[model samples]
Every structure is written in structure tokens, then in C-alpha cells.
Target: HHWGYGKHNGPEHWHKDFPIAKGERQSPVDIDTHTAKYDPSLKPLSVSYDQATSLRILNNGHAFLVEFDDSQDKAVLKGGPLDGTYRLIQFHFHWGSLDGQGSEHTVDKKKYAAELHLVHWNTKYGDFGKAVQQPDGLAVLGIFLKVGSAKPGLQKVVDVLDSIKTKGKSADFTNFDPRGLLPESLDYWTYPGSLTTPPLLECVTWIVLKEPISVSSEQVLKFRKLNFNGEGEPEELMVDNWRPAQPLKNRQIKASFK
Candidate 1:
């Protein structure tokens, strides 16, 4: 309740409680392509997901996330900047009210309509709770969403929004293969950064894809219909649920492709 994307409790004031908000490796850093180092040592990202692993989709007040069954390593992300296997826990998004600006990470200061974050925890560090506290415990795959043709792969997720309109609402969303939502190209920029939200843990190895997936402006608008307030409270639209780009500091962003 104390943290939100509003003038009163937005990013600017987060440092008051979560002091790590001012840390050296904060997330959603602007990708100045001209400056990113091309590292041939970086390998292509490897991802394997099972359709049956998808569990449910829910509105967690901040954003709607599709959870996965991570009891085993059925769905995971490896290779690239990662040294070990990371289990996919859930996938969520951050978007703007309009198509002009929504994505947490920007390219040369250009903002996309939205951004998708596929969160995974390093299995070597135990569960998500313990992994979150470790320096190399999480790997988040970030894919930008541009406003273009309606993507069939994304429509399935959008269609279910009506069922979870209020905060804390959730619906059964099984058998969905997250791989279908990925871009054809796996090229990406890798960096060490923290979570974009509160507590802002500096434990993620971010793999942000260069190519974006398309979602119509209309489809993107559907996310705004979700409420930030819970069932009984006054309705508040959950638009602009994105954190602004933080400073890159001394971090070196490496590219998987030249």
C-alpha cells in the first residue's frame, strides 16, 4: 500500500524505505545501443517451457501475472549470461495508458508500448524466497511490446483479462506455452540489475531481447481496464504500471549478437 506508481509513492520517494532503490545496479536502465559492448563470449539464450506448466493468471494489484508450476525444472532459462538453470515462476507486464510510452526499459531513449518480464529463480539458490536474497539468484527475460498488428499469441492472454478485472482476482490459465509469445530472434542485451519494484533487490541477470513482439494498440488498452484497488475499495485504473529508467552507473551492458 505504501508503494505505487503515483506522485505520492512513486519511484522518486522509494529510496526512503527501500534504500537499495539508490543502488548501483538498479533495473529498467535505458539501453543506449551505441554504448553497449558487443561480447562474443555471450551465448544464445536457451529456454524450454512445457504447456502443462502454466497454472493461473491473476491481478496482483500492480500487474496481472500468469503463474507457472515450478515444482520441477519443466520450464527453465539457461545459457546466455546465466551459469546455471533458472526455473520460470511467472510472467507479467508493465504498460502505459497510451501506446507512446509504457516499457520500463528504453532503446536510445525510445519507449515502447509495453514490456514483458518472464521471472525465474536460480534453482541452485533454493526457492524464490531464498534466491531473491542471493546476488545471482534470478534471471528475468525482458521483451518489448510494440504497437502493431494484433498478435494471436498474445490475444489468448488478453481475452482472459475480463475475468480478473479487480485486484486479487485470478482465473485458471493452464496449458499455455510461454514460448509462443517470444520473438523469432533470440538476440539480446545482457546486464546485471535489480528488480524494478519495491525492495528493489539487486539479484537479477537481465536478458532483454532486441526484437519486439507486436500487440495492437487496442489490445494494449485492455490492460488499463484493470483496477489498482481491491474489490471493496473505490476503483482505480492500473495504467502506467511501469517504473522509469534508472541510471546505469558503472554497469557494462553486453550484447549477445554483434
Candidate 2:
């Protein structure tokens, strides 16, 4: 059985198959801004990307991802809630079906137009596929996308969307620098949370950025154009591909900024 975001098998029904769907550390948590503890020990995130590591863009019947060549130490993320350097595997986005309803994580109940995830697997546990199943095995840098000025760094990927509008489609997307997409501040909130997708693994160390980057309403709408089906299948819009925030349980959302 395949997992999807359709009415027949949307998020509300995920737990029936993936038991971990309701796990204690499940993610996409609503960040109670007033409750986040300021921890001085949290380090500033360090990121380095090799332009050549940018590989292809794939619409995996989910979100469109700008994949990277994770085989090399060419791109790596360290510090800021990380025990070791994590290799950059790829980066993807999550958005909504309606205006300003996309982001997986909300701040004090305020949602944004969309969000970005820079997915990485800890070098300590090897590749992403293996690292994803272990605690402390993954680190995902989360950044919110607002409706405002268009982000130049992102325009590079935007220009290629027409080629891969449907599922099972992809294109060679190279020489793109992912670092340019980051905001000026490296300040973030850290916590132990699960992936926003199945098997809803509790292996991620969430480092969500405090400052949101802007994307024009026009560009943000383009995300909705992506299809959840392939060429011959029923054409369903892949909007609202974000998972609802789960309970924080006993975990604390710690801040890296003052």
C-alpha cells in the first residue's frame, strides 16, 4: 500500500499503517513562541554547498525536490544542534491548497504560505536511508516561506518547474548554490521531532529558522501546479502537502538565539 495525501488516505489515516505516526516526538509542532527556552549553548548553524553537488529536480508524487549528489562531502551542515557534520542530500518544499495555508510548522498558531526543508543525514549513521531510522540520525533545517518579494536564489529552481510538473518526472538541475537561499540570521529553535512524512520516523533533530524568507505570491502559487499523479493517472493538484503539527509531548523546543 502506498501513502498519499488524498481524501481516501490523507494524514488523518496515517496511523492505521505507520504506527509511529502518533509517536511522542512527532514533528510539525506549533512553536509556542512564549514557551521556547533560550539556550546559550546552542551553536550557530554552519552550511557549505558545492554548486556541482546540485543534481536534479524530481516531482516524487509528493513535493518537488532539488536533489544533490550526497556521495561527496561536497555539501555539509554542522553545528547548531548537530553533534557532527551532516551531508546535504536534497532540499524540498511543502505548501498549501489555499492562500497562506502551507507551512508544516506554525509559530504561536500563525501559519505561513509555505516552508522549506533542507534534508540531511548525519555522517555518523552513514547515508540518509539508513540514518533516517535511528534517533539522532537526521537533521532538517526548516525555513518558512512568506508571501512577499520573490527570492532570487529560488528563481533558479522555479525556472525549471514546467519540465517536471507531473509525478515521475525529473530534469537535470545543476550548478545551483543552495546556500544563497538561506536567510541572514542563523538563529533557530531546536528540538527532537519526527519527519513530517511517513513512516513518520522519529529520527530528526529539528532546527527551524527564526527568520522567514520571502517568495512572491506568483511563485508560491506555482507550487500548487505540481500534480500528485503521473501522465495517464487522474490529475490531482498536490497542494496542502504538509502534515499537521503533532504533540510535543515531554520535549522542549530550545532556541539558539537570545
Candidate 3:
């Protein structure tokens, strides 16, 4: 039913266990944080979302990927904050074994229960795939998920998680506005970085939110229950599918409030 690459079929044997794993961008590693001093004048321009835009949801069983129709609403980045109008693409997540500690980003070596990634692309650099090569060509909004009082924003998503529990079984998710999931405050910490996975392109402009959202313990447990199974009678359950933090190569993470 459900399986994954384990000790005998770990990262080393991922190709044997799951061929697709070779192309997919796996995360978890220390990123060098050192960079040029951020200019305070570099402010993100106010961008508007058009209602006519559409949203697509894919249920990969491991996680739900909600993609925005960027062709309709262009993500304009002004004030020289970075450069160009980056289109809102897709967003996904990464989790771990239990609640209150699964995410890769550690605050003073502390890990959160889970993490949310809202990935966008700089249209100026062309298509989303191509943008991954240029610095400042991408913007990834990272939000930490904590266990506590259920956040109404998250409740809406959790309500649909069960609808697609089986792997490769996705459905259309209509009337879902992603803006609702955004944290109350836009204040964030910015840094020039690379994708959390292999190929590890140094093209991302990370926007790690300062404040985290709350989710119920039940909501978190559901995520941990996800398994990545392969074609076989003896399938391995994927538990703790997170990569360790990479090195912060003398990079300074600049917080907007700071």
C-alpha cells in the first residue's frame, strides 16, 4: 500500500527503489548565509492578485502541492528589492516524525514541527525552470508550523488533506485563496541562497517568515503518517523524510524588522 526508501533502500539506493527520486529536488542541508549587506531602501513592491487567476492542487500522497496560475497574475518585485516580476508558481511542504519539531530550519539549532514553502519565480529571467539558474531569480517564502491552538488558516487545508490520502490521487481544489494562509505579518528575514536539494542552484532569494503559524497536534500527526511506497510486496514506509541543515557559509540573514 504505502512504502519508501529505507536503510536498505535509503538515499543511496533511491534510484533502485524509486526512479523518479533522481530528478526530484530533495531538501535539507546547511546553506551558506554570508552575503553583501542588505540595503534598507530595497523594499518589496506591493503586488495585487487577480481573482480570475486559477489554482491547481496535486496530491502526491507525500504532500499536497498547490500551484498558482502565474500567467494571469504577475508577481511584480519593485524598488530594486531583488529584480523583475516573479510569477507565483507552486508551493509545498516538508515534515518529520512528530509534532513541534520536523522542519529543517533551526533557530539556534532548534527545529520546528514542520515547514511551508511558497515558491515563486522571477519572470524577468524567463520560465520558472530557467529562473533557477540566476541569483535573485526566485523567491521562496518559508513559514514554520508549530503545534498549539489550531490556526483557522491551516484548518481549511487540513480539511482537504484526507481527501487525497492515497498516493497519486489528487483532486481539484476550488475557491481556495492562498493569501489566507499567509502569516498576519509580512516581516521576514531575507538571504541569498540555493535550493534545499541537489543541483543546489544558488538562485533563490529566501524570505523566511519571523512568526510561525499554529496547527493542532492531530493535523501534524496526519502529515507524519504519509508514506512513499514503491512497486513491490515488501514496501518500506518513509518516516522522517528530511535532510539535515547545511552549512551557513558566512552569510548574514537580514531580517526586515532589523
Candidate 4:
């Protein structure tokens, strides 16, 4: 019943394990900018992340996640479809194994080199796992990655990938602010959707950024080298580890800017 980005076990077959995968409002939709309605009432996203709150990095057999402390209000997110402050928990990425078309969500049906998701949970839920099961509980801020010049401060994160290059591996990754990984503009397309992974609960309020941060081909290649199978297991390179775009169906994608 577990999940991974394999032809048999990947996104397409996720519904077999978690029937909720077929739920309405699934994420990573094809965003037609022309059809996306501009909402003047959408509040600007407030992302106040503290580098000190960052704890470590882990390869959880699915994606490489940079976890943060969310017990306090230090690394918190407010505004942008959220009713209250949502505590920042962790961030992860999805990219292709070889080519540049690996992003989850697409714009005008165009794919990007990669995609990043900063996951957050509502204060009422208290815990991230619990919140993902509840309606109106999770918020994901997504950033698109384009293959170009390497982004500033991203090397700090890339430098540590070699240490946790396999499943179940982790390393102390402190004093790293996730904010530096974002683009200049917060402009985004927002919608109600579910997690792109197993137990795909329909609980997320997705906010996908309009602009993409740059990363060189070399920088992108580094992650692809990481093995999906843990140490002493089957050796398989991690690539194209992203779910394809899901159906939008009856959902409305609201834009933060005109």
C-alpha cells in the first residue's frame, strides 16, 4: 500500500492504495492563465521563515524533505487563503529524471524543470499529519523551478545532498531559511486541492507562484543522482519523480494579481 514514482507504484496507481486519490480537488492541475479568474480580495502571502528553525534534511524514500520547527510562531505563514497563522513544517521538491518536463502543476499546459512545495498546517490541527486528514487544514506554497542560472543561496542546500543521497538518510541542516529559495514575486494561482502523494486527503489550499526560480542543469543533475532505494537495497536512480497534472474539475483557480 506504500507509494513511489515507479510505473507500477507511482502517481497513476496511487488510487489503488488510497482510494481518496480519486477525490475531487486533486492538485497539480493544468492552470490556464487566461481562464484563471483574478481576485482582488486575495491577500498577499505572508511568509516569515527563520533560518534557525530549520532542523535537518531527510530522504524519506519519496522525496528529499527539509524539515523545520513549527511548535512556535517563528517559522509561520499567514494570509493568502488562510484564516489564521499556519505553522511551517517542511518543504520538498519534484523533478524529472532526465529532461526538463517534470513539474507537477502546469501553466498554459506548459511544464517546468521542477516544482517545490512548502507544506504548512493550521493552528487548530496542532499536528501536520492530523491536519492533512481534516478539511481546511493544510496549505501548500508551490514554486516552479526553471533550468537556467543557479539560484542564490540554493547551493547551501545542494551542498548537503551528497550526505543524504539515499533513502532513510538524514543530516543536520540548520540555519537555512526557506525564504531564500523563493522568487521575488508572491503572485500565485490558488485553489482547493489534495496532497499529491499517498493518503491524498482533500485538505490543501494550494498557492502556486507565478515566477520560477533559476537552477542550472548541473544543479538539477545533482538530485537525479540520488538513489531512491536505500543503502544495501536495489540500486535505482531517482528521476521523473513527480505526479502528472490532475483534473481541475469544478474547481476555481483564483489569481492573486491582475
Candidate 5:
């Protein structure tokens, strides 16, 4: 049976839901770090988008998975924070069982309603998988979600969520750009961290944006309405599928403007 959320469906309650989920390195809550030892100069890297890069969007019934073929769009990192050529690989989201809250990362131990992860690879390494093992190989741009006023920007993605609502179902999302979903401010917090998922590789350079994007309660409710089973018996609606927060494991967190 596939894992999901319900009364017995929280990350902490996963062991009972799916025995296998217990062994995986689940993500979102990692606050421990020995940051005092590392003081790399914080800088802001300039980002440029190449039209040649390809964007593919997949609606896998859970969330919208946007895959970027870096061969096309090149992200250049310049002075202020980090120096490197980072290529966009794929971007996805993490939501809860309900519309109220479900993301993994928290600010000072507070959880957001949802979270979006934009994963990138350091071009210096040449490959995304290879970069995953390096200290500064991966860069993830995170955005927090708060339920409030309707956000027209998010509609660019939410408008398509219904087109692909089944498992293994996909669509060709051509001419699609990600900048629309980005928050108003580019300023962000940076830190050395691990993937908030299994095999918890501690090689990610996380850039969590402070300003959050807005989404209406109705929009959030749409995501919760998705299902694990395509269309069949026991049409199980997806609800709190968020993983619980993980241990910080001695890692340092830093903000760009701080």
C-alpha cells in the first residue's frame, strides 16, 4: 500500500502507515548545525534565464513537478554571496494532508502551511547527481506558503493542476517559465544543509526566501483534493502528506541580508 496522510497519516505516524517510510530519510525539519566554524562571505549571485532551456511540467496527482533541462537555461552566480554557475534541474512542492499546514522547513520551530523547492545544480560539477555529493553542489530555493488573499502569480501553476490529476499521467508544459512563481523579493537566507528526504545527503546549499507568496484557501484546498489512486475504487483524497521535521544534525543556517 502507498503511504498517505489521515488520522494515522503524519510523518511521526508514518511507521504505522507504511513500514518502509520509517527507514527513509524524510525532509523539511533540520535545524541543527555547527555554523560558528564556517564564515563564508555572503554574496548575491546574479541570475539570468536562457530561453533555450526547456521546461517540462508534470501533474502527478500529488503536486506539480517542473523539470528544467539546464542545457538550455543557464543560471550565473556573481558577486555578493555565492560564486558559481548553477543550472536549474527540477522544482517541486511539499504540502500537508490538509490545507492548513504541511511543509517541512520551519522558522524558529514554526511550520509553514506549504513549501516549494526549486532545485539547482552547480555547473562547476557538470552533473546534478554528482553535485549532490559536493558541499556546494546543490542549491535549493525555498518559498513558504501562507493561506490568505488569492495570488494571481500562482494561478500560472494552479490553473494546470487539474489537467494532470492521475498517477503516471503527464503533459507537455512548453513555453513555461518559473519566474512567475518567485516571490517579490530575491533576498534570501543561505546555509549548508541536507535534502529533506531519504538518503538525506548533506550537500545542499539552501537559500530560503524570507518573503512568502500568497495562495487563496480555495487554491490550497484543490491540492488537498488530489488522490493517490488515479480514478478507481476507494478514491482516496490526499490530505496531510507532509513529513515531520527532522533533527538539525549540527548544521548552520545563514541569511543573505543578515
Candidate 6:
């Protein structure tokens, strides 16, 4: 069996196979503003996304992912909590079945309709595989999606969902700039954390943005229509596909602004 967001195969049971799921520095923590200490040393993140580098979009059972060509440094993320330049590899989203809850990382205990994760790997560590094993290898930029106005950037992904409705499905998706999805203000909260998914490797430098982009309720409904199961199997809508906030432990959360 494979891991999923179901009652049995969900996060609660992931620790059986991925023991690191219970380890410290887990991701998607409740970002308590009151406890966050502002760090003046943190620099404003640098994002240089090239539209020509977008490769394809796919349904990977867990989330709808848009992959990019990372062989070169066409698109990269630097500054913020990152020590060196990190190449943008892929981006994905996590959502809930309903509008009330969906985002992986909550701000001041408030949940949004969804969350976007822009995954990057440091070039200093060779490749994604090797980098993921290092503590300072990955820098995942997290952006919350609030339900209000429809987002043009997200609309592009939603429009292509039909081509990748089932698990393991993928389609050509290029010439799209990932920077279009970012919010106006880049102020963020930074901390040490793991991947929210299985294997739950504790390597990521989590940068959760303070501002959120707007989306519509209808757009989120379309996301819920995506199937977790492949075409041959029974249909299972992929929703609430986010891991709950984990313990903060002894880690300190930092803010880019006061």
C-alpha cells in the first residue's frame, strides 16, 4: 500500500514506515506571530523565475505539481533564510475539501483555503537527492491562498487540471512564470522544518510568507475534483491533502519584519 490522505493511510499512520515523521523540526507548524522573533539579518528573498523553463504539470497522488527545468540556474531563490542560491525545481499546492481549512501552515492559528509550496535545492549539495540529506539543502517557500478574488496566476494551473485529473498523469505546461503566483509583499516568517509529506526529511529552511494571494471558492472546488486514485481504480477526490501543523519543539521562528 501507498501513503494517502485517507483515514487509514494518512499522516497518523505515516510514522509506521517513515519514522522521521515524528522527529523534531517537522513542517506546517502553526505560525504564532506573538512568539515570532524578527531577525534584521534576514534579507529580502530574491526570485528570478524564467517562463521558458516550465516543463509540465502532473497529478502525483498527493498534489498537483508543476515541474521546471533545473539543469541550469534560469530560476533561482536566494537571500531570506538561505545561505546560498537555490535552484527552483518544482511547485505544488495543498488544499482542503472545504473552504474553511486547507493551508498547511497557519498564521496566528488561522487557516486559509490552500497553500503553495515552491521547492528549491541548493547547488552546493550536488543534486536534490544529496541536498535533501543535508540540513541546509532545501529552501521551500510557502504561500497561503485566501478565498476572495480569483487569481490569474492560479487560474492557469486550474485550467490545465483536466489534463491531469488522475494520479500519475502529466501534461506539457511551459512558458509560465512562477513569480506571477507570489503576493505583493514578500515579508515572511522563517524557521527550520521538515517536508510536510512522507519520508518527512528534516532538511528544509521554511520561509512562510506573511501576505497571501487571493483565489476564488470556485477555483478551490475544481482542485477538490482531482482524483487521488488512478483511472483504473475507484475515484477518490484529492482534498484536505495537507499535513496538520506539528509541534514547534525547541526551534525558534523568525520574522523578516516586525
Tell me the TM-score of each prediction against the true structure: 0.98, 0.97, 0.78, 0.97, 0.79, 0.98
- Tell me the tens digit of each residue's lDDT in model 6 across 84-186: 9899999999999888899999988899989999999999987899999999999999999989999887788889999999999999998888878999999
Worst 10 residues of 6 by lDDT: 43-52
Kindly indicate the candidate among 2 and 6 with the higher lDDT: 6
Q: On residues 129-224, what C-alpha lDDT tens digit does candidate 2 reach at each position?
A: 899879999999999999889999888888888899899999999889998789989889999998899889999999999999999888887888
The collision pairs in model 4 are 96-240, 97-239, 97-240
lDDT of 1 by residue, 1-258 (tens): 689888998889999999999999999899999999999888888888853388999998889999999899999998999999999999999999888999999999999999999999999977999999999999999999999898888888999999999988999998888987899999999999999998899999999999999988789989889999889999889999999999999899999887
Give the winner by lDDT: 1 or 6: 1
Question: Using alpha carbons, what is the TM-score of model 2?
Answer: 0.97
Task: Give me the runs in candidate 2 sitting further than 4 Å from their true place.
Answer: 50-52
How does model 3 score by TM-score?
0.78
Alpha carbon lDDT of each predicted model = 0.92, 0.89, 0.62, 0.87, 0.65, 0.91
Candidate with the larger lDDT of 1 and 4 = 1
Which lDDT tens digits does candidate 3 get at residues 1-258?
223324663345544544533432323433333332455765753444445243656656455677677774443433335565667787777777766556767665678888888777887776888888777778777888888877675666677766655556566776666666666776666766766543456778777766788888887777655446423434334345554665554466675554
Sorted by TM-score, highest first, which candidate order results?
A: 6, 1, 2, 4, 5, 3
Cα deviation at 27, candidate 5, in Å, is 4.7
In model 2, residue pairs whose N, Cα or C atoms come closer than 3 Å (at least 3 residues apart or on different chains), thus clashing, are none
lDDT, residue 32, candidate 5: 33
Report the lDDT tens digits of candidate 5 across residue range 1-258.
Answer: 433444553345555544534333334554433332233566664556545244667755455587776764454333334556677787788887665577767766667778988888788887887988787887787888888888775776677767667665566666666676677787666666667644457667777777888888888878776665676557766555556766544445665553
Distance from true location, Cα of 245 in model 1, Å? 0.9
After superposition, which runs of candidate 6 have C-alpha atoms over 4 Å from their true positions?
Answer: none
Query: In model 3, what lDDT does residue 167 have?
Result: 58
Q: After superposition, how far is residue 196 of candidate 5 from its true place, in Å?
A: 1.8
